[PDB]
Amino acid sequence: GTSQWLRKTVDSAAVILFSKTTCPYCKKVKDVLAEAKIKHATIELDQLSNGSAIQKCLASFSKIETVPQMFVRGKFIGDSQTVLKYYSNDELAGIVNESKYDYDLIVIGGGSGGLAAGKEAAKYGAKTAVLDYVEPTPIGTTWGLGGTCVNVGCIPKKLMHQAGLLSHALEDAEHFGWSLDRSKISHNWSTMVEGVQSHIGSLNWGYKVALRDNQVTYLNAKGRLISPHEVQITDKNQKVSTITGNKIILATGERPKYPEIPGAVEYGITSDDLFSLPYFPGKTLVIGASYVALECAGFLASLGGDVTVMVRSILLRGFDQQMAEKVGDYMENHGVKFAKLCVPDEIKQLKVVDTENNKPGLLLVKGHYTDGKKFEEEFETVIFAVGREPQLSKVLCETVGVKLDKNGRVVCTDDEQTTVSNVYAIGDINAGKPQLTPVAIQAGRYLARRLFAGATELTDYSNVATTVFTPLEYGACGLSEEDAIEKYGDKDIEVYHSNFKPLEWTVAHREDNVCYMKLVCRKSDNMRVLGLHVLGPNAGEITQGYAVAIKMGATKADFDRTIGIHPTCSETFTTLHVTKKSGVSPIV
Amino acid sequence: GTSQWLRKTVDSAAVILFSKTTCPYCKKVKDVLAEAKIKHATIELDQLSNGSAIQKCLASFSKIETVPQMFVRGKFIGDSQTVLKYYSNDELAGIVNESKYDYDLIVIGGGSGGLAAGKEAAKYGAKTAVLDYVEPTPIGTTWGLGGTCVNVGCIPKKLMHQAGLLSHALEDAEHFGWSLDRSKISHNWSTMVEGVQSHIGSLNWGYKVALRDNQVTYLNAKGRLISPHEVQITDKNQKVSTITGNKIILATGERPKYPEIPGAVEYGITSDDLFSLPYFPGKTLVIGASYVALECAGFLASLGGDVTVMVRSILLRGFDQQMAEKVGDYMENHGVKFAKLCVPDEIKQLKVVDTENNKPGLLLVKGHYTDGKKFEEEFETVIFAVGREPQLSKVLCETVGVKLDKNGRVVCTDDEQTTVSNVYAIGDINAGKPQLTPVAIQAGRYLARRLFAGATELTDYSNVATTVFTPLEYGACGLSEEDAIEKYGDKDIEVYHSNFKPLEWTVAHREDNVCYMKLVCRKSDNMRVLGLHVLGPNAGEITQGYAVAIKMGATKADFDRTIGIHPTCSETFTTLHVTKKSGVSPIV
């Protein structure tokens, strides 16, 4: 038990010191390592439950049981006297640097998970390389270091969401006594894209500075694992070479899909292209019904665009469908048009994009509805948001032995290990996990600590909260109502719910009964809260704190005995009492 | 145990039915009761663990052990056959209305607590009266039903805070691509006040409708308790009379204090006057440093005013002082002037308020700093925010025997009972309790259920979260850092903290390291979170959900294992790691 943990820690750590906070020979070794700029992990035995047992297990590697023991890459290096001997004879640098591999860790993919893993590993003395490359889109769009969320995801899409929210703030301001005239104000797309892109550029540069300051080697190159320890790299000049590493982390992410129809690749775009587009999209068709599809359609309409969404079946498949319907109904009342039960058959080009005068082209979209009727209409821009997929055949030679599932994602143990013992996978390519930026970051940092600092904590992937940043936002944590009913039966499920109205909406004359919240609870388990759902402003800020309580097993009685903060939207969760079974209206 | 509960429940319930969900004779009685429009409490014995014991205890009152059994004001009325006999003989109506008093419940005070208590009691059949009166301010200001929060508190102050927040939204809009010119836009005070007051008026009316629809008698009269069961009332024609009630709830609240200096009452105003003022205050001095003082100074500055705050000693006495200093520094960097360590000596009138042209007057303020130097400056408006106090020698004859503390608040047991057995107190006048609207509402509703429906649940007053709505908002739950250190010692306290920057502030070029958050934890109790603090936008929405986790005993490990929602401000709580003891900078 203790002995198996110690064996695993010693074999995998790059540089580690076993110590006690109270020993001056420890302190003497720490100071030498600091002065020579040797980073390392440290385990203070006097602050662990069974540190006395660990102290005795170390003798199986060092033949000693005493204070100060330093190891390098699985090898006992010495006690206090021996380390200082190496320091005084200028032998230490070569000892801490000798390795059978070029790197202790190679990270393939420089995004949310990969950068977090690489920076964390280097803090404990692991010699680390991070590889990142951005394959251009069909029209040629490319970007810098940081991954999907930083460049073409959460960061730019929430900034453009905020630009959309400010249109209603302009409207509201007149009712609160400000003298502007909303009807006389317009939006400039390229001015907003320039501000968004300047912030993204400061993030690209910040990550490059962070890697340099942690002594991480950054290679802007495409990586390919050709055997358990060998990574083939190709650079911007198509020069090819090979580097080796002890541990490997796969963190290459996904890219958008295109449907298999004429004209889609040639004449449509995706979210990869939208966030740096040099011209306003104009009259726009969004094909798809994911959160990506609805978030993009929502802010385009708030910025003054003429927007239509083509929905194959339902909105937000996999989310609570009552909440999904309320989200779509709000968008439809505030401008967005919906072509329901409809799919596209072909895109025809009518005008080429005017790259000179900075204007979109013009397209003819032909499709059909699920009963057979026809769809035909012209648009200036067509955006595909019909899902995302990894392309691991680009990354991973089949002979290496890493097992994939039927969707091409990596099959992992609960500690992110693949079917190849030294190879791990994190982020969106880890099969079956929520595909979210904070999950990738936690997985990457927690893994680096297990590999290189002797930690044991695993990532917990259950009950991870979400927020869809549609014009009226939707936050959730836990099960949808229909999933709870399927798992436990309707008779064992109680749902408390209410409409509400933000105080900010009263003077602004906004809608009385559109915001909505509910708690889905299990009767036979002390009214345990299985899922929480809220539609309203600032939904992500509302939901986050409740995720801690749900992690600890909150019940309805816990929400009842907690007192609200007034005046807020969030406080409505503390006084819910209308049940769905009762049939009493939730309006206020 | 069971028998003492049953006797207390039977003695004080107005109309109560003991029942079982499965018994058709009970259903037969229920149907009769609401056809005759008789409201009542119900206790379903099959839904309780010791229902068999309660059923045997009922025989001590009725001489029978079966269900249904119906009681009125402590008296057994009959089983199914007997109730129906009274019904078909038109005797039932007189039975259920027979009382030794005019009312089952008289509530003195029609505010947050009193309205909540009165409506809840009437739902279980208590015949209820709610008394409310508004003593005019020195300049004559008065308002309608609903109490301090609704008319001169939480509601108008947050609407005016929102008006101030919208000025920075106008500034931000240009950076996000909108074409307005912030420098050419101004604010109209009276347009704002008209919109605020129209919403307040809809609340006044809504409460009167609510009382009518719950069969509660509303008396717009001043009440005075002259003996345990006797309330003397004085109406708006100075007509005086007496009403009697079984239970009495005191819920009369507080009003603002004035300092004992010349000119203060004659020429200054308080928050009671500010929210309906017919002219913009102009150049304004705020005397005081409470949350009321800083919130009012904050929105007046955002609306274009020239504002000074005169601080006797410290800001936000009783709140965490690091956070208080950050709140004030932000205010001072955005225009609010502070006269520190300074008190007023006299207010001189230079111009009378111009009631025709709708303009303030002009005042000379003279004061002094604690070292003796002099303060002298002119202002158009002087607002006193130097505390609030009850005036129970106005509500309560000393001969009744209700004990007060040295500050004039009512001394109560943990079930809100005064030293007079039928008299209870809720809300701001209950000594030692947090003075907040949701606390008063919870106390009132829970008390009504114990009096008239046999409930046992008490109000929990510990770890109640707060938010101060200054221009940058400050939310908190639990102990300040200095209180935690005093209680447990500095070596048992660990503080995790970080600055942050809202994503919304990046493109808008707002400040990098002004928002701030920390967790104050107890080392020897598994790093229990003793206090949570955050300074930033939407701080009340951020804080609320974590108050459930703190109620449940959250530790630092609970925050660490919960995953963040991205991009939000709140997610920064899920990844904190810099400790104060380490000396590492919290900047980002």
Ligand SMILES: Cc1cc2nc3c(=O)[nH]c(=O)nc-3n(C[C@H](O)[C@H](O)[C@H](O)COP(=O)(O)OP(=O)(O)OC[C@H]3O[C@@H](n4cnc5c(N)ncnc54)[C@H](O)[C@@H]3O)c2cc1C
């Ligand atoms: C439009 C959109 C909006 C989103 N909004 C949110 C949101 O609000 N909140 C949220 O939590 N999540 C959001 N997400 C999801 C989030 O972006 C992902 O969950 C996250 O980026 C996954 O991180 P990752 O490390 O797995 O991969 P990525 O961030 O995709 O990084 C992988 C990197 O590796 C590179 N790479 C690929 N192959 C190779 C190779 N062979 N060699 C070298 N480098 C390679 C890729 O080009 C990329 O730069 C959004 C996603 C999209 C598309």
Ligand SMILES: Cc1cc2nc3c(=O)[nH]c(=O)nc-3n(C[C@H](O)[C@H](O)[C@H](O)COP(=O)(O)OP(=O)(O)OC[C@H]3O[C@@H](n4cnc5c(N)ncnc54)[C@H](O)[C@@H]3O)c2cc1C
């Ligand atoms: C400026 C300001 C801002 C505030 N902001 C917040 C905030 O954001 N959040 C928050 O939680 N709290 C806030 N508060 C506090 C909140 O207003 C109080 O905690 C709450 O109103 C107390 O309710 P209550 O029922 O105890 O008394 P009140 O609401 O004051 O109601 C008592 C009522 O009884 C009446 N009355 C008095 N004497 C008699 C009598 N003899 N006969 C009949 N009627 C009588 C009074 O006129 C009044 O109408 C604020 C307070 C102020 C002053």
Ligand SMILES: NC(=O)N1CCN(c2ccc(F)cc2)CC1
């Ligand atoms: N034919 C190929 O296999 N690719 C590999 C990736 N590619 C590249 C481009 C830019 C960059 F900065 C890094 C790498 C070059 C061509």
Ligand SMILES: NC(=O)N1CCN(c2ccc(F)cc2)CC1
């Ligand atoms: N004790 C007195 O001298 N009363 C106090 C009550 N006051 C009044 C005014 C308006 C109202 F609607 C109800 C009552 C009149 C004078």
